[PDB]
């Protein structure tokens with residue numbers, strides 16, 4: 001069963017595992033060769049409880065949003081939490097609103113639940129970008145806004161330049177990548193009502209031997225895989241939600257089961273000490 005957590009200070013709970021859609025319908029460019037199969041995979045995921053869907057305008061060169069737009073027609077729009085993002089070349093006002101409009105056209109929906117700046121662009125003033133996002137909110141095209149790949153100092157700057165609340169910061173965070181801890185970003189989010197959304201929450205390969213050995217012992221004690229332990233570790237943290245890459249039905253089932261794991265206080269301290 002899906003774990004839910006409050007988003008920001010919105011009073012709204014969202015699935016604490018998002019459905020990562022990078023690669024569905026292509027990566028950087030559109031891939032049409034598996035459209036029927038991919039729509040079926042998206043519907044299967046949503047039916048399992050993955051109603052929080054993470055995508056972006058540049059996923060599959062726009063085709064990922066198109067495939068999501070077909071899959072979601074089997075469901076009530078208000079039951080889904082759809083996240084999209086704008087590429088850093090589109091952060092000027094007119095370009096952002098065009099990116100938003102085209103995202104809504106490809107999704108064939110009237111609004112996105114959450115819209116994020118994918119990556120900061122120092123050349124474009126944050127106040128302009130955030131003011132354009134607020135126009136989208138005022139028009140009913142966006143429910144919530146957030147940022148992605150903003151370190152602590154830039155998140156603070158964004159908060160100071162945003163009319164609307166910044167409800168999240170989506171950053172890379174996993175058992176080996178501790179930049180959000182070392183930056184004080186996780187602590188800032190926990191103390192300021194911002195959800196930290198961990199992408200690449202699983203490190204599937206190239207782990208250190210100390211990490212592998214520690215995860216293997218805890219996984220054994222819980223009858224789980226090391227990937228389930230990596231996810232449970234993130235989900236145990238206040239204000240942390242995770243976006244595993246969907247991939248396939250086996251991953252969707254395994255990751256959903258990771259919400260059933262209750263790590264002990266000893267296990268958490270041991271995992272915390274790996275980075």
Ligand SMILES: COc1ccc2c(C(=S)N(C)CC(=O)O)cccc2c1C(F)(F)F
Pocket residue numbers: 022027028056058085118148199
């Ligand atoms: C459009 O191009 C992208 C976009 C995003 C990425 C990402 C990221 S950060 N994501 C897929 C997650 C996201 O965009 O939210 C990781 C690696 C290569 C990428 C690439 C690229 F493959 F080119 F390098």
